[PDB]
C-alpha cells in the first residue's frame, strides 16, 4: 500500500522571471548530482554538480528567488562527479575539497554570511589549490571528510591516504575513529586509530561507486547486488529481500528512527531511493525491535497529483488556445515552460497561435518530458526532524514525499482491501461518467449555491432538474442498479457523518509556501472529488430534504468552497500563497515544518480556515 504522496516543488514557480535575479559567478584561474546541506543557523543550502565537472552552484532553499546563487566554475575537470567532493561547514564557512584532473587539490572557503548577503562580488583569495603531494599515475575517485579536520582519500586497487596539508596507513565513519569502508566485490572493512589495522573484514559468503552504506547508532545497513544486508564491535545479522520487476539502480539510502505510520510497534525505518532513467521510486523498510519480528515494505506515490491530473484527464476545475496556453504556463513553473519554448525554437517549430491544435499538443508533450527530466532524482535529504526531501537533477527542483492522511490513503489505494467501501462504490459508479457530465453537475451545484437555480425550488426539485438536464443522458442503467444495490448495504447516515464532521471538516517563506500550497491543493482536490460523488448520489436518487438537510447544505457549501479554491490555484499561485500564509501565520510568513504531524496539522489548519470562511 502506498502511504506517501509526491509533492513537486519548483522554487521559482510563483515568480514569472527565472532564474533568480541575483546570481554570482566565481571563476578560479542538464544535471548530474544535487544535494542539500544544513548550516549552523536554521537554513538549508543546496549545491549541484551538473554537467560532469567544472560546475559548483549554491543557492538557499528558503529564499531561492530573492536570495542569491553562487556559481563556482572550475579550471580543470574532475576524475569523478559528486564523489571527488566533500562539502563541510567549519567555523561558519563551507569547506569545499575537490581533486581536479591536473592532480591538484582545491580547497574552497565559502563564508556563511556571503551566500546570505545581497553582495554581488567579494574580493579575497578564498580559492587556494595544492599542486604537490599527488601524482598522475595514481588518481583517486573518492574523497571522504573525517570529522576531526581530516580527509581520507581512497583509490581503485584497495588503498587509501590521509590529507593533513599527507599521512598514510562506499565508506562511512562509525563512532569517532572507526572508518567502515566498502569494496567492489564487495566486502566491508573496518578502521580505527589504531590507524594501521582493521577490526574485521567480510567474507564473500556467496551461498547465504555509489551510496551503499547507511549507519544509525550501532546498526548498519548495506546493499548486496538485491539483498538488504543488516549488521548490528559486532558485525553480524540477517539480510532481507527486495521487490523488483525490471532493472533498478539505487540512488540514496538513509537509516533513521521510526516515523508516524499505520504499523505495529517498530524499531527502525529505512528510506531507499531507486531510479530507472528519469523515473524514481521511494520505498521504506519498517523494522520491529531487534531486527527480527518484522520487515515491512511501504510504497509511495511516485508521481505528484498534478502529473496524474495531466496524464489521466482526471482534472475537472481547469477551463480556446489562449486560455489553454495560459493554463499550461501556470501549471508548470516558468523555468520548465521557457526550457520547452527554447527546445521547440531549436527544432524550428513556429507557433500557429489562434485555432492551433498540433502546436498545443506538441507543447503539452514537450512540457511533460521537460518536467520528467527536471525531476530526475540524485540524492535524499532529511528535513525538519522527519520530513523527507528528494533533490532533483535540474536546479530549483525538489520533491517532498508527504505522509498521507486517511482520506489521501483511501484515495491513492482504491483497489486494495466501512466508509472506505462506501467511497469505493461511489467512485465505482462515478468513473463511468465523462468529464463533461461531471463539470455540468458541478456547475449545477454552483448554480444551487449562488442562486442561479431558483431557491423557491425544493431541493428535490433542484435535483430532478439537475438529472433531467445533465444525467438525463445515457448512463449505463446496469451501473445504476449496481450502485443502488451496493448502497443498500451501508448505513448511509452514519458514514456520511463520519465523512463530514470528523474526516473532512475539523524566516521568509517561501519554501513553506511551495509545499503548503501543493499539499492543500491535493487535500482539497480529493475532498472535491468525494463531495462531487456524494452529491451525485443525492441527485441520482432523490432523498428527503429532512434526513440530510444540514448534510446537503454543508455539502453544497464545501463543494462551492473547494471549486473556488481550485480555480484560485489555477491562476496566480503567488498571491494565493501570500493570502493563505498571511491569514494563518503570526508573522504572515508561515510555520517551520519540523515533523510530519506538524505539517499535516498546518495543512488541516489551512483547510479549517477554508471551510469556515464567510460565503
Amino acid at each position, epitope marked *: 500500500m502506498a502511504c506517501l504522496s509526491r509533492i513537486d516543488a519548483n522554487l521559482l514557480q510563483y515568480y514569472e522571471k527565472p532564474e533568480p535575479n541575483n546570481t554570482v559567478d566565481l571563476y578560479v584561474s542538464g544535471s548530474e548530482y544535487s544535494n542539500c546541506l544544513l548550516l549552523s543557523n536554521s537554513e538549508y543550502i543546496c549545491y549541484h554538480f551538473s554537467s560532469r565537472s567544472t560546475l559548483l552552484t549554491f543557492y538557499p532553499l528558503s529564499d531561492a528567488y530573492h536570495g542569491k546563487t553562487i556559481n563556482i566554475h572550475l579550471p580543470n575537470a574532475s576524475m569523478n562527479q559528486r564523489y571527488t567532493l566533500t562539502i563541510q561547514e567549519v567555523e561558519q564557512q563551507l569547506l569545499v575539497n575537490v581533486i581536479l584532473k591536473d592532480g591538484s587539490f582545491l580547497t574552497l572557503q565559502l563564508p556563511l554570511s556571503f551566500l546570505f548577503s545581497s553582495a554581488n562580488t567579494l574580493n579575497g583569495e578564498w580559492f587556494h589549490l595544492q599542486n604537490p603531494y599527488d601524482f598522475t599515475v595514481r588518481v583517486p575517485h573518492f574523497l571522504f571528510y573525517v570529522s576531526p579536520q581530516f580527509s581520507v582519500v581512497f583509490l581503485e586497487d584497495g588503498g587509501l591516504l590521509g590529507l593533513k596539508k599527507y599521512l598514510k596507513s562506499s565508506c562511512k565513519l562509525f563512532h569517532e575513529r572507526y572508518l567502515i569502508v566498502l569494496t567492489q566485490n564487495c566486502h566491508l572493512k573496518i578502521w580505527d586509530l589504531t590507524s594501521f589495522t582493521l577490526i574485521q573484514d567480510y567474507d564473500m559468503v556467496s551461498q547465504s561507486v555509489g551510496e551503499y552504506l547507511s549507519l544509525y547508532n550501532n546498526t548498519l545497513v548495506t546493499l548486496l547486488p538485491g539483498l538488504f544486508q543488516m549488521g548490528t564491535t559486532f558485525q553480524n545479522n540477517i539480510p532481507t529481500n527486495l521487490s523488483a520487476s525490471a532493472i533498478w539502480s539505487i540512488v540514496d539510502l538513509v537509516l533513521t528512527r521510526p516515523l508516524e505510520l499505520n504499523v505495529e510497534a517498530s524499531y527502525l525505518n529505512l528510506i531507499v531511493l531507486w531510479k530507472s532513467g528519469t523515473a524514481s521510486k521511494l520505498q521504506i523498510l519498517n523494522v520491529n525491535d531487534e531486527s527480527f519480528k518484522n520487515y515491512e515494505w511501504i510504497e509511495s506515490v511516485n508521481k505528484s497529483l498534478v502529473d496524474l491530473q495531466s496524464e489521466h484527464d482526471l482534472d475537472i476545475v481547469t477551463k480556446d488556445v489562449e486560455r489553454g496556453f495560459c493554463n499550461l504556463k501556470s501549471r508548470y513553473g516558468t523555468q520548465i515552460f521557457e526550457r520547452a519554448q527554447q527546445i521547440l525554437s531549436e527544432n*524550428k517549430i513556429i*507557433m*500557429a*497561435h489562434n*485555432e*492551433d491544435e498540433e502546436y498545443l499538443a*506538441n507543447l503539452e508533450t514537450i512540457l511533460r518530458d521537460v518536467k520528467t527530466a527536471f525531476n530526475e532524482a540524485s540524492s535524499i535529504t532529511l528535513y525538519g526532524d522527519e520530513i523527507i526531501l528528494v533533490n532533483c537533477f535540474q536546479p530549483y527542483n525538489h520533491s517532498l514525499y508527504k505522509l498521507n492522511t486517511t482520506v489521501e490513503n483511501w484515495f491513492y489505494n482504491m483497489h486494495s482491501e466501512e466508509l472506505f467501501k462506501y467511497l469505493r462504490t461511489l467512485n465505482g459508479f462515478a468513473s463511468t461518467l465523462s468529464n463533461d457530465v461531471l463539470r455540468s453537475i458541478s456547475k449545477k451545484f454552483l448554480d444551487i449555491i449562488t442562486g442561479e437555480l431558483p431557491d423557491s425550488m425544493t431541493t428535490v426539485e433542484k435535483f430532478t432538474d439537475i438529472f433531467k438536464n445533465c444525467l438525463e443522458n445515457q448512463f449505463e442503467i446496469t451501473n445504476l442498479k449496481i450502485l443502488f444495490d451496493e448502497l443498500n448495504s451501508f448505513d448511509i447516515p452514519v458514514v456520511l457523518n463520519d465523512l463530514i464532521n470528523n474526516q473532512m471538516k475539523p524566516k521568509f517563506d517561501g519554501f513553506t509556501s511551495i509545499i503548503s500550497l501543493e499539499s492543500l491543493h491535493q487535500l482539497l482536490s480529493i475532498h472535491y472529488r468525494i463531495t462531487l460523488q456524494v452529491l451525485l448520489t443525492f441527485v441520482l436518487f432523490d432523498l428527503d430534504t429532512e434526513i440530510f438537510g444540514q448534510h446537503i447544505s454543508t455539502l453544497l457549501d464545501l463543494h462551492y468552497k473547494q471549486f473556488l479554491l481550485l480555480n484560485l490555484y489555477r491562476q496566480d499561485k503567488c498571491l494565493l500563497a501570500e493570502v493563505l500564509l498571511k491569514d494563518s501565520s503570526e508573522f504572515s510568513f508561515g510555520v517551520k515544518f519540523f515533523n510530519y504531524g506538524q505539517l499535516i496539522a498546518y495543512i488541516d489548519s489551512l483547510n479549517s480556515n477554508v471551510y469556515n470562511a464567510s460565503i
Partner: nanobody
Amino acid sequence: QVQLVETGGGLVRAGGSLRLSCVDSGRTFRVYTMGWFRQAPGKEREFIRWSGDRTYYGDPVQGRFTISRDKGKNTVYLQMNSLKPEDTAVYYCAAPAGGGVVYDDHKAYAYWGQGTQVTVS
C-alpha cells in the same frame, strides 16, 4: 474559402524601391501569418508570425527589406528598398495550417497570388 490577394509589384531599376501588400478576405484565424517567400524563374521558392511576436528575415535581403503587419489583421506589407537584379523573382504570400516552420515549403495552407517582377540596371 478564404482568398489571399496581393499587389504592389512591377519592374524597377536596380536600387529603386517597391512596396508589396497582401490581405485576406476570409476570417480564418488571427494566427496564421503570411510568409513573403520568393522564387526565381527556374529556381525553388526560397526562405511575421503570431502578431509580430517574432520576425525572421533571409540573408540576401536583411537590412534591405522591411516586413510589417497591422495589429489584429491578416495584412502583410514588404517595403523593398535597394533592389538588385538578384531580387528578380516571383514572390508569394502564405498561410499555415497546424504546426508550421519559417524555413520550409511546408508552411502554407494557401498562398497563391503569384506575381512576376523584374529589375534592370
